[PDB]
Symmetry: D5
Subunit: 196 residues, 10 copies
């Protein structure tokens, strides 16, 4: 396939998602008729469609405005970028922060877009490992920088709730490239800097 | 209309859930054939059964080992009891803590039991307002005490993600009974204590 | 006039806002031609249009889903709702948090919509005093509750920057109604509860 | 092309700004006749002139009272210097702190002066990367020292509001020179000190 | 039977304890010949004795130096007294702190001793409800003041471990005597000084 | 003897433990006839069986679903995993956190299970040191990774109660395998992301 | 004599102060010939003129733009307004914060100016107490409000240096006018929102 | 006997203490001849006459500068005043903080002076319950206020080390007079106002 | 002379100290006859033999249980060990915390025992620089490790009160051995690992 | 001229200071007959003397007891020494803290004295650059160790007030001697112990 599905297709799956969600309510042993549940099959459906929109977006139309500042060549960092994704294993959320650092080469992407790349890839059914590696890469390919480093710390409800309610159970997953990858003195500066 | 769906009543729909989910994924724009979504409809099917595993429980039996202390009549408080529940509108987790306090008459409920109570009502498609009241009731009922006062604070994922990504939006819901309802110097004492 | 202007009208004022913003760049003593400034007249214009969208929205189409829970009648609170508005005196931002509390009567509005009312009124050219009073009112009229209380603490850049750079210079502006207005014991519970 | 626009050069456009703003408001959907927007185009006109009041200043004269200490050559550091600047793309404030450190050769700049430097470059339509470098330069230049190292951390309102309301998104930008650039055990010392 | 059991009985109860713990080790499915548990019966025996030495002490022999300053008739407080105890239900540590607040009448108890009255009552198989009230009274007896107010906060390990990991769930109890019981301005004013 | 001892061995040893404790209550100088310790032996016994169930679980057994990701070769870490456990020397709880880190080879382990491995070993008569090296290994061997890094910190109740009262007395213990051990860089960078 | 002393009186007294200081440097046993104190008198003199410029400003003068809002009758507060000042007893800085609160009548004062009133009085040889009652009044009289509440906390350098070294020694001083004074409720609720 | 004992007496005192220590250095188990102890009986000799200098000092020569400001009649608070005393029971330190609050009438004492007063009594062989009443007292006589409010808090070293080794163990002692004593709404506003 | 001095000697010591205090109570300016001082020479008498009990204790009867675990050879850290000593220079307390780190070889000492060792030297007339070396020492001899790493931190009461009244004034003292001494990459990882 | 100027010159320089300050008062446009400034010349005179008493002291008379422990050759640290000083440029307080780290050789300086070397150098008209280096050297001289490392952090009031309110702007300086200068592992390890 490939191509990102827009509002048209999403506008049609509503009834089937609605129904998929109606069938569920009954199976949990619930009475779909309560005043509450009443319009849930649509809301839920309608909602699920949101935590998964990164699908109908492409890193190209999202790109653009990658200012050719060049004149700098020194570690830019955008920390604490908020992220809310969907565990692809049990359709449950895992939410956290993302930090990014790079060694611009000739180009330097606007800051407003780095928080965007994070959204194109987070609003999908993901695994943390991959969301990370995907952001880093998009950044590289688009900016062609000397080195990119992405570290993602997030809490998963799959843990925090089912199985065993272990709050804190924060998992961090990094992906270093180039200078960050090769040179540890740099990678060291990155980490010991995303703290404060 | 009664009947706490049991093991076979669970095992009978699991495959039904599995299906409605296998649907959803397709209706989502994904491909249930990848490695991650191969086993999801079950992982999910099963997950969701967990978060609504409070339906099959009864306060009656859940009760007991409720010591006839009596000779105290001096406010007992169990705070920071962690809670995890499901929004019944979009079916998105909402998490927080529940605090509870009372004035033992002739009975003083086993400590652990207070958290068990909190657990039967949260593991259900809920609404914070109601979830707060039910707990508070079950205690009034199962302990016929001088006064009850339950306060729940939990952060919603419905808000925090979709709509208007507002974290920090902690919605607090109180519910007082008896002495707590009437005597406000008792109520005013409770709140200033469920803090430090 | 009255009626809220949508994307059509906004789609036409772009060139005049663009130009209004081009004329400015030159007047600040800047060379509109730099690689940077180059597409700013459109971005800025495009942006200004965002911090002011609460105009094209109406508290009616935004309302709906004001669940008739009724059965409760005890202080609901949604604290820490983030807010980012525009000083109507010098077109500079003032950003902060909003807290809301009420005594539901027969109806109880979904939580997802309270954070919404805040947005319909904050994305406009405002004064803090008014943004506050407007939220409170919308809530009242829509929910017909026993009492509503809104407190808004925000920092203004007009201060924090020009004039005299006084960080912290946080201003709080409250608006109590009904029970909150009349009864101070209640209003007391509210405030001493939006803290923690 | 040189010439730090002065008083008359300011007073000549103020009315021009006032107009372009009186426009904007109308082009916005507002009514410049209300009481608040009556005097805005000036308040704004004037405000904006303030935030770009660094154009009319020169590091040359701004310099001086730069003591010929010399006999130290041991790292001096002025941190937490508060900064306030303007995004040159959407023209939305971005605020933070700038930290600076060096190794006095034969000259040691007056303390206050370091902050004055920081002030000439921030009060302009800027871009954080550049704003960081300029400061660092002006110091290398005006002090011909062994090594300079400037680090700016500031939160952007462009992000924080529009696009994807991400607060906490603090983007840090470093820029080292001389010993700092080369000697990393000096650079590594700086960063671990601009903290506590 | 009363009468304290000392190290002559605390040496005449050990080998029995060693035996029982030695039995436990096996009934638990371990090998009591392992390096680790080689002398564990003796240790856990000796430990158990320690945790329950409070029995072998008489408040009266704990007292003595109960100075007759008399002149003060103003609230004294001894906060954050560390308290380690043994849940008599499962014999599992519940730990916390105590806060004491009396109103001197004719004698002020030597401060260091308000800490002893604690170890006499906590070092025994207990219930929080009682650990509390006991400490109050004891004081009341040994001083004959105008009012005594005791609040204890403890986190029972039976919960934080068995039952299924519920940390935080701190439990707070209070036994007000005299003024504190009656004069509320006093009780409350007490509870606002035990927080900072 | 080996062979996982299931709920069967236990269902018979319980009444032994129950009797063993009965012994202890009297040996402690208490009365097994009070309403309190009247059933204590069965609670205590039963409780002891819980804190030592890791015995009845086989690592291998719990694995199953070690998704074959391979594609990463970038450190995955899971901090703040809670852990409660027993001291084999005196049989007193010892609790704290466990943070694990590893360098996926061809296989990556589902994060949910990375936390189960900890409970199969924490639920036994342990010694931090051992408890540590065990998780380390059980993981090397389950994922055949380029490297494992495991660190635990916990407060032993033995110290913080008996013996002395020396609280805070947290004890940390590392155990790096593979690269974490070899390459001293990866080991240090682990150690930093586990602070954050 | 009164009459606001402008930059004129000062432009002549400076060389007096400058000479006065010259006196002091030598009286201190120092040398006014070192490179340091070589120009100190003119810096010191000049500096002293700055810390006492509130003299040359008239409240009335700074007002002008007390927007006629009226429409509110709901407490507006402005906390954390910074303030630096001089001790008239020893002429040593004393610094801290100022938090103001009032109940708008027909007029509401632009928040920017609510902070200027503080600098016209903080910039003089003051005594906290006085400095306080002054802002209070200058505000009653400028907005003719239902009530004013003003509170200041600051560390006097006299104590924290000379005399002793007693640091922290922050001193607070209230001064309620109108309702804040009368109605003891509004006064208390002020006092709480200024903590938050 | 009264009448202050100055240096002329402390001098004649230094060798009877010096010996009193060369005796307790020996009767200790130590060999008072070493390098470290060679001078302890005199070092410690002068240190004791130190912690007890508050004796030879009268608040008649200490008061003075009891400024006749008056026209304030609004509460004045001097918190976090550092205080360090001796346990007259065991000659063991016990350091802390003194907060003082009063209502001016016809006189307002200079703040510098409020600290000097806490010292005159804080430097003696004292009793916390006592050290207070005096400090509060001196003030009603030396200023004839409307009512004083002193509250002290300190950690006694007699329990922290010997006894049971309990830290944190803060003991708050208060003494209210005039309005503070009689009018609670004041007393209260006082306490809550010294926690900031 | 060596050989420990027990109770039989401390007893014969209690009256030569008691007098040594009834002399320093008098030669102080106080009247040792009161109610409070009536017993200070004996209360304080036994308190001194207390803070100096570490003398009559040998680590031969203190060690024991030097468990032959071995198979760990991974760093073991026991931080925040509470320690309280006496300034042999002035007989003034000085409380703090001791952190100990070592590399097991063929033996791992039980943690409970690590604290008991800090006490044997911590309870004597000491020197911080000294109290360390010994604690670190005992360990290389009592465990023949790969290298110890002790670091102590405490606030001496000799400066805090007498001298200049300086709080916070922490004095950290360290002593590295074996690997710790020689191998920095370890020494380091040690320090950074005890700050958590 | 050298030779310290004492209270015989400190009484022979007062009336001159009183006069000059009395002159300042007038040149400042105030009335020296006001109750407040009635005796202000004398006070500010006396104060000034205090702030500059460091001149009248000789390091050599400050020393003495410089114990010869010799045996340690391990880093000692005296952190957070409170420091109040006088900017010789405008004679305006700059305040902060000091951290000292030496490597004992043959003698350890009596701790309390490392605080004195401070007050001798800070209590004078100073520059931070120098206050620092001086304290280093001084130590170096009076001890002849292997390395001395001094870092001072101060917030100059000339900035935080004059120039236009720039708080935070803390300034940090460091003078490394011996090992610290050379052996970096030492310098850095120093700077990581002066943070926690
Ligand atoms: Zn998951
Ligand atoms: Zn929802
Ligand atoms: Zn504004
Ligand atoms: Zn921007
Ligand atoms: Zn229990
Ligand atoms: Zn143990
Ligand atoms: Zn003063
Ligand atoms: Zn004592
Ligand atoms: Zn000392
Ligand atoms: Zn200066």
């Amino acid at each position: 396939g490939e191509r990102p599905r827009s509002e048209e297709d999403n506008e049609l799956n509503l009834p089937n998602l609605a129904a998929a969600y109606s069938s569920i309510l009954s199976s949990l042993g619930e009475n779909p008729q309560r005043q509450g549940l009443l319009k849930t099959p649509w809301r839920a459906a309608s909602a699920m469609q949101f935590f998964t929109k990164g699908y109908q977006e492409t890193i190209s139309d999202v790109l653009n405005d990658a200012i050719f500042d060049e004149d700098h060549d020194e570690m830019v960092i955008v920390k604490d970028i908020d992220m809310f994704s969907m565990c692809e294993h049990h359709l449950v959320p895992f939410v956290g922060k993302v930090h990014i650092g790079y060694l611009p080469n000739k180009q330097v992407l606007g800051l407003s877009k780095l928080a965007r790349i994070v959204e194109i890839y987070s609003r999908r059914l993901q695994v943390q490992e991959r969301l990370t590696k995907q952001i880093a890469v998009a950044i590289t390919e688009a900016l062609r920088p000397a080195g990119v480093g992405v570290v993602v710390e997030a809490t998963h409800m799959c843990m925090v709730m089912r199985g065993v309610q272990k709050m804190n159970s924060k998992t961090v997953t990094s992906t270093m490239l180039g200078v960050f990858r090769e040179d540890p003195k740099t990678r060291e500066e990155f980490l010991t800097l995303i703290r404060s």
